[PDB]
Paper text:
In contrast, crystallisation of an ultra-thermostable mutant β1AR-JM50 with cyanopindolol in LCP produced well-ordered plate-like crystals over 100 μm across. β1AR-JM50 is 12°C more thermostable than β36-m23 due to the inclusion of 3 additional thermostabilising mutations (I129V, D322K, Y343L). In the cyanopindolol-bound β1AR LCP structure the side chains of Ser2125.43 and Asn3106.55 also form a hydrogen bond. The LCP structure of β1AR-JM50 allowed the identification of 38 water molecules, 7 lipid or detergent molecules and 2 bound Na+ ions per receptor. Firstly, the site is within 2.2–2.6 Å of 5 densities assigned to 3 water molecules, the hydroxyl oxygen of Ser1283.39 and a carboxyl oxygen of Asp872.50. This results in the proposed Na+ ion being co-ordinated with 5 oxygen atoms in a distorted square pyramidal configuration, as observed in many other protein structures. Measurement of the thermostability of ligand-free β1AR in the presence or absence of Na+ showed that the thermostability of β1AR dropped by 7.5°C in the absence of Na+, suggesting a direct role for intramembrane Na+ in maintaining the stability of the ligand-free receptor.
There are three β-adrenoceptors (βARs) encoded by the human genome, β1AR, β2AR and β3AR, which are all members of the G protein-coupled receptor (GPCR) superfamily. Here we present the 2.1 Å resolution structure of thermostabilised β1AR crystallised in LCP without the use of a fusion protein, which has facilitated the identification of an intramembrane Na+ ion important in maintaining receptor stability.
Residue numbers in the entry: 36 to 240, 275 to 358
Write the structure that this text describes.
Amino acid sequence: LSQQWEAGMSLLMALVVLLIVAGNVLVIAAIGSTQRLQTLTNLFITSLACADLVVGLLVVPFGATLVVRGTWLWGSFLCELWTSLDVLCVTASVETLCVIAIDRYLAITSPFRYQSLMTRARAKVIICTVWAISALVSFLPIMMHWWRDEDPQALKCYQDPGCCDFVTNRAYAIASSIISFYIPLLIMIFVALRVYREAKEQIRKRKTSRVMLMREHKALKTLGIIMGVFTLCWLPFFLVNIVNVFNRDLVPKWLFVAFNWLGYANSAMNPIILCRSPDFRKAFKRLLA
Ligand SMILES: CCCCCCCC/C=C\CCCCCCCC(=O)OC[C@H](O)CO
Ligand SMILES: CCCCCCCC/C=C\CCCCCCCC(=O)OC[C@H](O)CO
Ligand SMILES: CC(C)(C)NC[C@H](O)COc1cccc2c1CC(C#N)=N2
Ligand SMILES: NC(=O)CN(CC(=O)O)CC(=O)O
Ligand code: NA
Ligand code: NA
């Protein structure tokens, strides 16, 4: 009966990996094969799809083995590398979303300046910077062991290569959460709501025709959906992360795990959301025979 749960979960995990990996490869292949999707924003979408792809290839497969076997198989170094890459992908995702929000805000409020100053290459640089900042805030604190807690339970986990629970001290939990997630999220949300306001003002009445603006507004809607779904998927984990460093009894392990998997599920969601934007849909239809 533990074998039918081990087999039951193995098959389900393999399908999660397939969906994440194939969906995000399909997004990247749509953008790379279609003139109409060669927009700056979609370059930023590429960054997201990449973080999702690292989630599907590296993070979920290690994680599934933890989930179904109930112990860590891969030794102490890969435990730390896995954790670091998990933390990095979440960080780079929320920083890219906050950049998309700011970029669009500047695009709609200064279309002339924006289109005369932004390039495909200058976007690729912003993206690079994002991943460099994300890797710094992610990798460095892990590497330096600034996260370690001094409780015996924590110390027993750290001595056991078969334990890979991210048991951290309070200081690290709060500070890493602020810097990796809560500040870029709050900024993304504030700025996105202003983009939404300004778009609304504009269609109501730019020299642009109202039909052209409505088409601009459909593509902005896509990005807003991705942002709201990212918020719904990750905010519970981050709220619970903080409750739990203050009282470990408030959040049982299996529940903590469930919240973390709702975050990982975000990486399946974007390609599916993109399926309903018209330009992406067309491209997916062509690509899949
Ligand atoms: C009118 C006065 C109202 C003031 C209220 C605003 C308060 C803070 C709001 C946003 C912070 C903006 C932080 C800027 C950090 C983003 C850096 C960046 O790289 O932006 C992406 C780039 O612009 C892509 O083209
Ligand atoms: C609870 C999640 C909070 C976090 C949120 C993050 C920022 C998202 C900002 C705005 C929503 C974007 C979608 C805006 C949709 C407006 C489109 C509309 O007009 O509604 C139906 C339309 O009329 C039919 O064509
Ligand atoms: C298996 C684990 C627990 C590894 N999953 C990590 C989670 O997906 C991402 O969690 C985080 C992302 C960024 C910053 C973070 C963070 C957790 C903490 C803490 N203290 N700081
Ligand atoms: N045996 C090894 O290769 C690594 N070891 C030690 C470690 O990962 O810290 C794992 C173990 O002792 O179970
Ligand atoms: Na992501
Ligand atoms: Na361990």
